[PDB]
Amino acid sequence: AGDRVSFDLSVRLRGQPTFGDDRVEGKEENLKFYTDEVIIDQVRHSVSAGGRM
Amino acid sequence: AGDRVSFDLSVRLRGQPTFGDDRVEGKEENLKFYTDEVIIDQVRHSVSAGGRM
Amino acid sequence: ALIQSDFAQGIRMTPVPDCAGDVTACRFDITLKNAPAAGDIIELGVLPGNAVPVEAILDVDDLDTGGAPTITLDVGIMSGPVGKNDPARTCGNELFAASTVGQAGGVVRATASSAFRIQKAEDHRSVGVKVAAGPATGAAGKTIALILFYVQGTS
Secondary structure, three states, X not given: OOOXXXXXXXXXXXOOOOOOOOOOOOOOEEOOEEOOEEEOOOOOOOOXXXXXX | OOOEEEEEXXXXXXXXXXXXXXXXXXXXXXXXXXXEEEEOOOOOOOEEOOOOO | OEEEOOOOOOOOOOOOOOOOOOEEOOEEEXXXXXXXXXXXXXXXXXXXXXXXXXXXXXXXXXXXXXXXXXXXXXXXXXXXXXXXXXXXXXOOOOOEEEEOOOOOOEEEOOXXXXXXXXXXXXXXXXXXXXXXXXXXOOOOOOOXXXXXXXXXXXX
16 A cells, blocks of 8 residues: 655765775765655546437 | 885896807896886775664 | 865765764865855755764865955854755854854854754754855955864763
8 A cells, every 4th residue: 555655776885985094983984875756646537438319 | 014016027138149159258148127116005995884773 | 056065975974973972073174166255055064963063163264355354154054965955955053153254264163152052863964154244355265174073972
């Protein structure tokens, strides 16, 4: 049951490496997730066949 | 345990050969080399999986 | 009108403490390719979630050129998500109340009673200076910096 489904993209890691012996603990790139959503509605149509005349 | 590597190039032998029966004991070419060095270092980077919430 | 520093696009990440009460500071800086003009919102630094500012030196170069300078900078917790690149962002003056630094390259500390009392939110927020009053005629490429002694895990 639902009228909306959301699916995510995990973008690449962009950052600066720590050259030499510079301490890296505590400087940790956060994974960036991007979101999107699609919504569902009905689409109906009807045709008529006249009468008995 | 090393921080830099120094490889070598053995350039060709060049000189004038001694034609005939002329004695050859001092007209000896010398092996000349060339050197280049490469310096190593450390890179690293880290990503944080997040909290427990 | 958004100047996204390297610390907001994700090019350079910010340090977050691995404990409670352990202060943390990082020099959020820009190299302004253009010259500051009224209305610019210089997104310079991000304040990590569950962290609150504790002390903040704002250090800028000489942003004026002529006499009687009038450039004023205010620093606040910008509302939008990090690195949105959207002019609709609001900014504010929670950290600095229209600081007079920029008329001469100098160092100012958080002299306001609201900079030290800032609530925390579980999501990253971007700290960005805004040029409230337009600078006097004349400017050039200069480095605006703002170190931000924030601590995580308060109560």
